[PDB]
From a paper:
Here, inspired by natural and re-engineered protein–peptide systems, we set out to design proteins made out of repeating units that bind peptides with repeating sequences, with a one-to-one correspondence between the repeat units of the protein and those of the peptide. We use geometric hashing to identify protein backbones and peptide-docking arrangements that are compatible with bidentate hydrogen bonds between the side chains of the protein and the peptide backbone. We design repeat proteins to bind to six different tripeptide-repeat sequences in polyproline II conformations. The proteins are hyperstable and bind to four to six tandem repeats of their tripeptide targets with nanomolar to picomolar affinities in vitro and in living cells.
Reasoning that proline-containing peptides would incur a lower entropic cost upon binding than non-proline-containing peptides, we decided to start our experimental characterization with designs containing at least one proline residue; in most of these designs, the peptide backbone is in or near the polyproline II portion of the Ramachandran map. For the polyproline helix, there are roughly three residues per turn, and, probably because of this, we obtained more designs that target three-residue than two-residue proline-containing repeat units. Crystal structures reveal repeating interactions between protein and peptide interactions as designed, including ladders of hydrogen bonds from protein side chains to peptide backbones. Our results show that by matching superhelical parameters between repeating-protein and repeating-peptide conformations, and incorporating specific hydrogen-bonding and hydrophobic interactions between matched protein and peptide repeats, we can now design modular proteins that bind to extended peptides with high affinity and specificity.
Numbering used by the authors:
A (entry chain B): -2 to 9
B (entry chain A): 0 to 171
Amino acid sequence: LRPLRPLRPLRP
Amino acid sequence: DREEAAFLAASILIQHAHEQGKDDRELEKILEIAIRILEKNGVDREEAAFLAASILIQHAHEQGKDDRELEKILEIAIRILEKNGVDREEAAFLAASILIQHAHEQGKDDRELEKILEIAIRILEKNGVDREEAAFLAASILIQHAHEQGKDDRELEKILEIAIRILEKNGV
């Protein structure tokens, strides 16, 4: 189980 | 802010290049230049490559591209992550993670989410990991992201059932 960094939402 | 300013500039450039429909060579040159500007503004090299890849994959998913051109985009992202010192297995893992996290955040229905999962499994398998491990990685990414978004028990069961279908379709 590898921890995963939070996704960054894409600009409009 | 410096970091976010560079990120927005890179995003504009990558998305506009993709919208133009230019080939993968010109696209790779655009990604190189985006990573160079991110790196010039104090972002770690690996982190800059990661951000470029996420921008590319997220735009390509938003445009609703077919599975073949989408997996080509994924191969491009993996190649860039490789070129910036990321292990190929870790590179494919990151790209698949980007794709699947964006798909879950979009609220995409289950029939299409399973196709997205199968695509991530295809690229992980093509890199050189077993289908069982690749499906387990996909399921892991999906479950972790769903649990981190604070989803309710109902959506959690739906996610777990989707992941279990994936696993018993690809080696269990």
